[PDB]
Design a protein around this motif. Structure first.
Motif, PDB file in Angstrom:
ATOM      1  N   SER A 448       0.825  -1.213   0.000  1.00  0.00           N
ATOM      2  CA  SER A 448       0.000   0.000   0.000  1.00  0.00           C
ATOM      3  C   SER A 448       0.866   1.272   0.000  1.00  0.00           C
ATOM      4  O   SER A 448       0.343   2.373  -0.188  1.00  0.00           O
ATOM      5  N   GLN A 449       2.189   1.107   0.198  1.00  0.00           N
ATOM      6  CA  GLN A 449       3.175   2.187   0.238  1.00  0.00           C
ATOM      7  C   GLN A 449       4.081   2.200  -1.001  1.00  0.00           C
ATOM      8  O   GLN A 449       4.499   3.273  -1.430  1.00  0.00           O
ATOM      9  N   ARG A 450       4.346   1.019  -1.598  1.00  0.00           N
ATOM     10  CA  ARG A 450       5.119   0.869  -2.835  1.00  0.00           C
ATOM     11  C   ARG A 450       4.509  -0.239  -3.700  1.00  0.00           C
ATOM     12  O   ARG A 450       4.190  -1.314  -3.190  1.00  0.00           O
ATOM     13  N   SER A 451       4.345   0.046  -5.006  1.00  0.00           N
ATOM     14  CA  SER A 451       3.750  -0.824  -6.022  1.00  0.00           C
ATOM     15  C   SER A 451       4.357  -2.231  -6.140  1.00  0.00           C
ATOM     16  O   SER A 451       5.518  -2.380  -6.514  1.00  0.00           O
ATOM     17  N   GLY A 452       3.541  -3.236  -5.830  1.00  0.00           N
ATOM     18  CA  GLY A 452       3.863  -4.656  -5.929  1.00  0.00           C
ATOM     19  C   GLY A 452       5.123  -5.171  -5.271  1.00  0.00           C
ATOM     20  O   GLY A 452       5.939  -5.821  -5.933  1.00  0.00           O
ATOM     21  N   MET A 453       5.273  -4.926  -3.959  1.00  0.00           N
ATOM     22  CA  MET A 453       6.411  -5.415  -3.177  1.00  0.00           C
ATOM     23  C   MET A 453       6.236  -6.922  -2.998  1.00  0.00           C
ATOM     24  O   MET A 453       5.126  -7.376  -2.712  1.00  0.00           O
ATOM     25  N   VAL A 454       7.321  -7.697  -3.221  1.00  0.00           N
ATOM     26  CA  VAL A 454       7.365  -9.173  -3.193  1.00  0.00           C
ATOM     27  C   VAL A 454       6.502  -9.712  -4.366  1.00  0.00           C
ATOM     28  O   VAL A 454       5.367 -10.145  -4.148  1.00  0.00           O
ATOM     29  N   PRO A 455       6.994  -9.630  -5.627  1.00  0.00           N
ATOM     30  CA  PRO A 455       6.167 -10.062  -6.765  1.00  0.00           C
ATOM     31  C   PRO A 455       6.099 -11.564  -7.036  1.00  0.00           C
ATOM     32  O   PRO A 455       5.197 -11.999  -7.756  1.00  0.00           O
ATOM     33  N   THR A 456       7.036 -12.355  -6.482  1.00  0.00           N
ATOM     34  CA  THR A 456       7.082 -13.801  -6.724  1.00  0.00           C
ATOM     35  C   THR A 456       6.759 -14.682  -5.516  1.00  0.00           C
ATOM     36  O   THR A 456       6.926 -14.262  -4.370  1.00  0.00           O
ATOM     37  N   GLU A 457       6.301 -15.921  -5.798  1.00  0.00           N
ATOM     38  CA  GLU A 457       5.970 -16.964  -4.821  1.00  0.00           C
ATOM     39  C   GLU A 457       7.257 -17.465  -4.157  1.00  0.00           C
ATOM     40  O   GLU A 457       7.244 -17.785  -2.969  1.00  0.00           O
ATOM     41  N   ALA A 458       8.359 -17.529  -4.935  1.00  0.00           N
ATOM     42  CA  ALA A 458       9.684 -17.942  -4.474  1.00  0.00           C
ATOM     43  C   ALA A 458      10.195 -16.959  -3.414  1.00  0.00           C
ATOM     44  O   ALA A 458      10.736 -17.390  -2.396  1.00  0.00           O
ATOM     45  N   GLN A 459       9.976 -15.642  -3.639  1.00  0.00           N
ATOM     46  CA  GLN A 459      10.341 -14.577  -2.703  1.00  0.00           C
ATOM     47  C   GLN A 459       9.413 -14.598  -1.491  1.00  0.00           C
ATOM     48  O   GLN A 459       9.860 -14.313  -0.382  1.00  0.00           O
ATOM     49  N   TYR A 460       8.132 -14.965  -1.705  1.00  0.00           N
ATOM     50  CA  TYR A 460       7.102 -15.093  -0.668  1.00  0.00           C
ATOM     51  C   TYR A 460       7.455 -16.255   0.270  1.00  0.00           C
ATOM     52  O   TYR A 460       7.338 -16.111   1.487  1.00  0.00           O
ATOM     53  N   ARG A 461       7.896 -17.395  -0.306  1.00  0.00           N
ATOM     54  CA  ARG A 461       8.306 -18.589   0.434  1.00  0.00           C
ATOM     55  C   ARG A 461       9.599 -18.312   1.204  1.00  0.00           C
ATOM     56  O   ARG A 461       9.731 -18.765   2.341  1.00  0.00           O
ATOM     57  N   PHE A 462      10.535 -17.543   0.592  1.00  0.00           N
ATOM     58  CA  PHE A 462      11.815 -17.161   1.197  1.00  0.00           C
ATOM     59  C   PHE A 462      11.622 -16.381   2.499  1.00  0.00           C
ATOM     60  O   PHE A 462      12.387 -16.598   3.440  1.00  0.00           O
ATOM     61  N   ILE A 463      10.592 -15.501   2.557  1.00  0.00           N
ATOM     62  CA  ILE A 463      10.240 -14.720   3.751  1.00  0.00           C
ATOM     63  C   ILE A 463       9.816 -15.684   4.865  1.00  0.00           C
ATOM     64  O   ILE A 463      10.340 -15.587   5.975  1.00  0.00           O
ATOM     65  N   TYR A 464       8.912 -16.642   4.547  1.00  0.00           N
ATOM     66  CA  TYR A 464       8.434 -17.679   5.471  1.00  0.00           C
ATOM     67  C   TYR A 464       9.604 -18.520   5.982  1.00  0.00           C
ATOM     68  O   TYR A 464       9.642 -18.853   7.165  1.00  0.00           O
ATOM     69  N   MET A 465      10.564 -18.837   5.086  1.00  0.00           N
ATOM     70  CA  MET A 465      11.768 -19.607   5.397  1.00  0.00           C
ATOM     71  C   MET A 465      12.735 -18.813   6.275  1.00  0.00           C
ATOM     72  O   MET A 465      13.354 -19.400   7.159  1.00  0.00           O
ATOM     73  N   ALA A 466      12.851 -17.486   6.044  1.00  0.00           N
ATOM     74  CA  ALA A 466      13.713 -16.594   6.827  1.00  0.00           C
ATOM     75  C   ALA A 466      13.148 -16.361   8.224  1.00  0.00           C
ATOM     76  O   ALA A 466      13.913 -16.310   9.187  1.00  0.00           O
ATOM     77  N   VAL A 467      11.810 -16.237   8.334  1.00  0.00           N
ATOM     78  CA  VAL A 467      11.102 -16.044   9.604  1.00  0.00           C
ATOM     79  C   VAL A 467      11.240 -17.327  10.452  1.00  0.00           C
ATOM     80  O   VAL A 467      11.617 -17.233  11.622  1.00  0.00           O
ATOM     81  N   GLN A 468      11.019 -18.510   9.834  1.00  0.00           N
ATOM     82  CA  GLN A 468      11.150 -19.829  10.471  1.00  0.00           C
ATOM     83  C   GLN A 468      12.582 -20.068  10.969  1.00  0.00           C
ATOM     84  O   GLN A 468      12.763 -20.575  12.079  1.00  0.00           O
ATOM     85  N   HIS A 469      13.586 -19.692  10.148  1.00  0.00           N
ATOM     86  CA  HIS A 469      15.010 -19.833  10.459  1.00  0.00           C
ATOM     87  C   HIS A 469      15.404 -18.933  11.633  1.00  0.00           C
ATOM     88  O   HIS A 469      16.084 -19.404  12.546  1.00  0.00           O
ATOM     89  N   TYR A 470      14.940 -17.658  11.630  1.00  0.00           N
ATOM     90  CA  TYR A 470      15.211 -16.679  12.689  1.00  0.00           C
ATOM     91  C   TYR A 470      14.639 -17.095  14.046  1.00  0.00           C
ATOM     92  O   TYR A 470      15.282 -16.867  15.072  1.00  0.00           O
TER      93      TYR A 470
END
Length: 486
Positions: A448-470
């Protein structure tokens, strides 16, 4: 986003356009030939044309056309601009409710009720497939009680047992959102927001990742169906005097969140966690180097995050001088004090000051991430997490520090991934292991602040993987503080 069809073939798209459409009718669908990419099926002269939309990871590239941030911004552009001549006149609405927020299907009576009690609030609703009557549906609304309203499917048309008959469930939900149903006891069946299933406590992260690994594509598609709600004005970027300040002429910043330079334009947006700030910007151009240092100074930015490597295309221009060298970028002076090299990044100690003002001098720490791949995302998120922890500890060390400048190419792909991970890990760093975290809701908030942040499913999964790892490194840390060691 009615024009998007999630479960149709190329042949089905042609039949739907020839039998139920006209000249100028169109729809969007995921490419089954190449997963990740999309196809724009448009009818012209009584024939169907299929145009490829390449989702590179940095942008949505129309094959032999223009580059965009979202699929909604691509459609919005061609419905009011020139040109392809192929015309996008009538969007062909989708009957499939699978990709919607409120739809569940697999859910049952007691299961939906148990989810509404804890996860839901006043106005929480869901649409599930009927158990006792196959073909029909059920609308379960929380208000303090949970009310069930049957949706009868009579000859491909949906109804609540009385009133208007709808072509799709999305048409039924949208109508009763505007005109709410009234209970016999004077209660109002308000359809305020869909039930949040994506919201999870940061302790049950591994279990949720396990569920989505068997999933992730279903959850990300639901988030992509929300990009029509984020169609804010991008008029300032569209200006003639601002066209060459843009790397990609259509990936423009939102006017309400853009960085105004107090010659006032820069393709950058201020990211605020609306529940530490960030400046999500594009890769520096040879004509925007001066505007970049004006932004870092004005906003009082002390940490710069470069997500693109130093080493066959330009993604960012060398906006910093060589080690021990001093450079004048208009009214701004940058001094490269020292360059520290790590395996994953390069830290550059830069001293920014206004020409003629020694008092305005401050240290700007530029973090240059190098290990990121040319194509796709890495499987291990450890390198990015170690980098972001270092970025956060540098930001926290400075007393009067502004937003963290993050950049890649379009300032939407990696920039979006790095910002979202840093927001989510900041909640886990401050509020501990036990805290409510929502991955798509945080992305939508950033979107809602910048146009289409995180455009891919691979990048979407990477966030979930980074949060789980942290969370795992945090859990091992507390367990080690309790471990008997020698």
């Amino acid at each position: 986003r009615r024009w998007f069809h999630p479960n149709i073939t190329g042949v089905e798209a042609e039949n739907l356009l020839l039998t139920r459409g006209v000249d100028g009718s169109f729809l969007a669908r995921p490419s089954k030939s190449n997963p990740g990419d999309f196809t724009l099926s448009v009818r012209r002269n009584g024939a169907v044309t299929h145009i490829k939309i390449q989702n590179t990871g940095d942008y949505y590239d129309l094959y032999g056309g223009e580059k965009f941030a979202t699929l909604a911004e691509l459609v919005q552009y061609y419905m009011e601009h020139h040109g392809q001549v192929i015309e996008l006149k009538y969007p062909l609405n989708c009957a499939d409710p699978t990709s919607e927020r409120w739809f569940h299907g697999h859910l049952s009576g007691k299961e939906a009720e148990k989810l509404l009690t804890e996860k839901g609030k006043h106005g929480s609703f869901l649409v599930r497939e009927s158990q006792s009557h196959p073909g029909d549906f059920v609308l379960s609304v929380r208000t303090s009680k949970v009310t069930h309203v049957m949706i009868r499917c009579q000859e491909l048309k949906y109804d609540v047992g009385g009133g208007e008959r709808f072509d799709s469930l999305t048409d039924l939900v949208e109508h009763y959102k505007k005109n709410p149903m009234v209970e016999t006891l004077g209660t109002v069946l308000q359809l305020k927001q869909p039930l949040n299933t994506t919201r999870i406590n940061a302790a049950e992260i591994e279990s949720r990742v396990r569920e989505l690994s068997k999933g992730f594509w279903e959850e990300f598609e639901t988030l992509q169906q929300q990009e029509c709600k984020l169609l804010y004005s991008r008029k300032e970027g569209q200006r003639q005097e601002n066209k060459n300040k843009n790397r990609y002429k259509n990936i423009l910043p939102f006017d309400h969140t853009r960085v105004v330079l107090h010659s006032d334009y820069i393709n950058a947006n201020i990211i605020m966690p609306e529940f530490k700030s960030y400046i999500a910007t594009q890769g520096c151009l040879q004509n925007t180097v001066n505007d970049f240092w004006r932004m870092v100074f004005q906003e009082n930015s002390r940490v710069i995050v470069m997500t693109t490597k130093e080493v066959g295309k330009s993604k960012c221009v060398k906006y910093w001088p060589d080690e021990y060298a001093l450079k004048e970028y208009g009214v701004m002076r940058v001094r490269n004090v020292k360059e520290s090299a790590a395996h994953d990044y390069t830290l550059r100690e830069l001293k920014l000051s206004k020409v003629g003002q020694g008092n305005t001098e401050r240290t700007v720490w530029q973090y240059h991430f190098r290990t990121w791949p040319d194509h796709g995302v890495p499987s291990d998120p450890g390198g990015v997490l170690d980098f972001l922890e270092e970025v956060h500890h540098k930001q926290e060390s400075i007393m009067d520090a502004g937003p963290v400048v993050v950049h890649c190419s379009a300032g939407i792909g990696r920039t979006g991934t790095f910002i979202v991970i840093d927001i989510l890990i900041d909640i886990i760093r401050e509020k501990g292991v036990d805290c409510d975290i929502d991955v798509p809701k945080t992305i939508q908030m950033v979107r809602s602040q910048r146009s289409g942040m995180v455009p891919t499913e691979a990048q979407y999964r990477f966030i979930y993987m980074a949060v789980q790892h942290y969370i795992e490194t945090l859990q091992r840390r507390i367990e080690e503080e309790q471990k008997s060691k020698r």
